[PDB]
Design a protein around this ligand. Sequence first.
Ligand SMILES: Nc1nc2c(ncn2[C@@H]2O[C@H](COP(=O)(O)OP(=O)(O)OP(O)(O)=S)[C@@H](O)[C@H]2O)c(=O)[nH]1
Ligand SMILES: [Mg+2]
Ligand SMILES: [Mg+2]
Ligand SMILES: [Mg+2]
Length: 178
Amino acid sequence: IRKKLVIVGDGACGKTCLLIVFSKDQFPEVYVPTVFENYIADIEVDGKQVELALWDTAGQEDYDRLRPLSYPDTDVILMCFSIDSPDSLENIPEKWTPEVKHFCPNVPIILVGNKKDLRQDEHTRRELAKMKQEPVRSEEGRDMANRISAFGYLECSAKTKEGVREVFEMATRAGLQV
Ligand SMILES: Nc1nc2c(ncn2[C@@H]2O[C@H](COP(=O)(O)OP(=O)(O)OP(O)(O)=S)[C@@H](O)[C@H]2O)c(=O)[nH]1
Ligand SMILES: [Mg+2]
Ligand SMILES: [Mg+2]
Ligand SMILES: [Mg+2]
């Protein structure tokens, strides 16, 4: 069984690192902004073996014209934001949802808060407070998932690996329903 998974969300929100930690079980140390990329992952969930094609896309606005080339025949969307960037969450209904609903009507969307490790990081908290900001609250993420009619809401850290396996378990489960 093969499923196509596409990942989308603001530049630097952690999409590539999430994909590669799961697929290669290594955190990529060099940050290379994505135009497009592709990885395979194997997963066994609930006694079922599935092969995932992981379609990586550009977060950057400069590659908006190329990004719809990733959308055909998608089984599940991972729509990401970063927990250290309230701006990335605001972009969910303003940018990512209208695009994904346009090109992928009826494809299940999992809303994913990335970089969960930064929520309790004191250095992050203090930097954000200088800007009158704080890490995204889980509640804000859940409220957004309900607003955009997501299939599910999850948080993870590719850096620590927390919640990473669950992201792809839920994605595979969404994938298995059409
Ligand atoms: N602290 C922390 N940093 C992370 C985590 N995941 C990725 N990053 C870091 O954030 C930066 C962006 O990560 P990356 O995964 O490459 O972003 P992207 O969403 O794929 O970005 P783009 O390709 O749309 S430009 C990198 O420096 C990376 O090491 C995480 O879980 N925790
Ligand atoms: Mg990337
Ligand atoms: Mg069109
Ligand atoms: Mg939650």
